[PDB]
Design an enzyme around this catalytic site. Structure first.
Site, PDB file in Angstrom:
ATOM      1  N   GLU A  79      76.933-101.422 -38.778  1.00 37.50           N
ATOM      2  CA  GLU A  79      76.258-102.763 -39.166  1.00 37.50           C
ATOM      3  C   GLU A  79      74.911-102.793 -39.990  1.00 37.50           C
ATOM      4  O   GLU A  79      74.800-103.459 -40.966  1.00 37.50           O
ATOM      5  CB  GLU A  79      76.005-103.459 -37.752  1.00 37.50           C
ATOM      6  CG  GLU A  79      77.474-103.876 -37.063  1.00 37.50           C
ATOM      7  CD  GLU A  79      77.435-104.148 -35.506  1.00 37.50           C
ATOM      8  OE1 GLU A  79      76.293-104.381 -35.213  1.00 37.50           O
ATOM      9  OE2 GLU A  79      78.247-104.371 -35.048  1.00 37.50           O
ATOM     10  N   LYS A  92      83.206-106.309 -26.435  1.00 33.08           N
ATOM     11  CA  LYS A  92      82.473-105.102 -27.136  1.00 33.08           C
ATOM     12  C   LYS A  92      81.467-104.221 -26.374  1.00 33.08           C
ATOM     13  O   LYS A  92      81.223-103.188 -26.679  1.00 33.08           O
ATOM     14  CB  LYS A  92      81.516-105.719 -28.229  1.00 33.08           C
ATOM     15  CG  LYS A  92      80.901-104.908 -29.258  1.00 33.08           C
ATOM     16  CD  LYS A  92      80.242-105.638 -30.543  1.00 33.08           C
ATOM     17  CE  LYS A  92      79.505-104.738 -31.377  1.00 33.08           C
ATOM     18  NZ  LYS A  92      79.114-105.423 -32.671  1.00 33.08           N
ATOM     19  N   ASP A 100      67.734-106.638 -36.302  1.00 32.46           N
ATOM     20  CA  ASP A 100      68.773-107.415 -35.893  1.00 32.46           C
ATOM     21  C   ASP A 100      68.785-108.048 -34.530  1.00 32.46           C
ATOM     22  O   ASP A 100      69.112-107.207 -33.426  1.00 32.46           O
ATOM     23  CB  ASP A 100      70.145-106.448 -36.104  1.00 32.46           C
ATOM     24  CG  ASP A 100      71.467-106.867 -36.034  1.00 32.46           C
ATOM     25  OD1 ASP A 100      71.575-108.375 -35.298  1.00 32.46           O
ATOM     26  OD2 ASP A 100      72.492-106.446 -36.201  1.00 32.46           O
TER      27      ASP A 100
END
Ligand SMILES: Nc1ncnc2c1nc(Cl)n2[C@@H]1O[C@H](CO)[C@@H](O)[C@H]1O
Length: 385
Positions: free
Chosen positions: A175, A71, A199
């Site tokens: 997200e 990623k 997050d």
């Protein structure tokens, strides 16, 4: 049947999660080892390709051929300074194919090279097969999530990973948007709603501020640290226990790769226990030179060991507020995402910073993104009919 069904996939840097919305509820689907999240790891061995838990479980024995962090590479050029900097810290080879990075490994005794989207497609194929085993039929429609800061190239390469994996990508959603959907923060009627998403995952920290105006999401600010996460806290515990072993036995274990890895996994486990108990016990048989390492640590000592790192999570929170041009009292909702947000000291620091405010944390933070993606995938497949 299968055509009226859609899944939500959180394709994370270190872990991935899949959910399905059916019969009025989200089901976060457990893999074949009973885990609700699956490591974003792909291992290439002398006989097979491993994905997830089995790949993470043999990382010590085969580090050159165990791929993770794809990623961090996806949608990027080889010359990108993010790629050049990260490459120095990976045990697998990264090569250049016409300014595009490929991960190069040994598989079944042969040299093979893969694009980041090919690596991510193998993780996606696993999430697809996990959903299929649960449902009893193949599901191909999916919503896949990406960080809010991903550009068009990174979003397109993630969609490409989905296509390679045999998924029909209904939409690529952010997200923090999926996390806000999970909490139903887009269904509060009229008026602009300001949401902050905090997050803190295994290897990255992201702060996002969103405005929800009549169901329409707008990203006001993104801040954080791409190299801060749960694994830095595991490493702080490792250094403590390496120093404690030296004080008790007058032996430095830091050079014994096996001793350090067994200590690291035990530290990660003890860290999780420290989120619901005020002490955790380490029980390592024959850690180094036949010496057992049976010890314990308080939550107070762990908090001291990571104190500077926990406190550092508030600088991107303040930075995001200034970028969004909002004061603390102008934020309507605070949402926790990532397994590391379960740490009581982290929750206390964030709540105190927001002047004693309640946090949205009732949904498993490592599952909130897949939860929201699953809700959106259900709405999108119903509109497609
Ligand atoms: N109970 C917990 N207390 C603290 N950290 C936790 C916890 N659960 C997970 Cl997962 N993590 C960590 O979250 C990351 C994945 O999102 C990993 O670093 C994992 O250790």
């Amino acid at each position: 049947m299968a055509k009226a069904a859609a899944i939500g996939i959180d394709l994370g840097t270190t872990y991935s999660c899949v959910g399905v919305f059916q019969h009025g509820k989200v089901e976060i689907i457990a893999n074949d080892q009973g885990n609700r999240t699956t490591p974003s790891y792909v291992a290439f061995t002398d006989t097979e390709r491993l994905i997830g838990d089995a790949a993470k479980n043999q990382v010590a024995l085969n580090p050159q051929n165990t791929v993770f962090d794809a990623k961090r590479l996806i949608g990027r050029k080889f010359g990108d300074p993010v790629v050049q900097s990260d490459m120095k810290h990976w045990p697998f080879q990264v090569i250049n194919d016409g300014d595009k990075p490929k991960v190069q490994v040994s598989y079944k005794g042969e040299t093979k090279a893969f694009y980041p989207e090919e690596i991510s497609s193998m993780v996606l194929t696993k999430m697809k097969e996990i959903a299929e085993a649960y449902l009893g039929y193949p599901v191909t429609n999916a919503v896949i999530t990406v960080p809010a800061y991903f550009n068009d190239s990174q979003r397109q390469a993630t969609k490409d990973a989905g296509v390679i994996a045999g998924l029909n990508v209904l939409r690529i959603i952010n997200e923090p948007t999926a996390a806000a959907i999970a909490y139903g923060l887009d269904r509060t009627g009229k008026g602009e709603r300001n949401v902050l998403i905090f997050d803190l995952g295994g290897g990255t920290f992201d702060v996002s501020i969103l405005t929800i105006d009549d169901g329409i999401f707008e990203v006001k600010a993104t801040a954080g640290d791409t190299h801060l996460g749960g694994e830095d806290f595991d490493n702080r515990l490792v250094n403590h226990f390496v120093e404690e072993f030296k004080r008790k036995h007058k032996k430095d274990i830091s050079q014994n790769k096996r001793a350090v890895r067994r200590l690291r996994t035990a530290c990660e486990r003890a860290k999780r226990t420290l989120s619901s108990s005020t002490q955790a016990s380490l029980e390592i048989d024959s850690l180094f030179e036949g010496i057992d390492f049976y010890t314990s640590i308080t939550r107070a000592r762990f908090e001291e060991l990571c104190s500077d790192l926990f406190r550092s999570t508030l600088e991107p929170v303040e930075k995001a507020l200034r970028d969004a041009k909002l004061d603390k009292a102008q934020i309507h909702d605070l949402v926790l995402v990532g397994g590391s947000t379960r740490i009581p000291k982290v929750q206390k620091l964030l709540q105190d910073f927001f002047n004693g405010r309640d946090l949205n944390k009732s949904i498993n933070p490592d599952e909130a993104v897949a939860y929201g993606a699953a809700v959106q995938a259900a709405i999108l497949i119903k509109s497609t009919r």
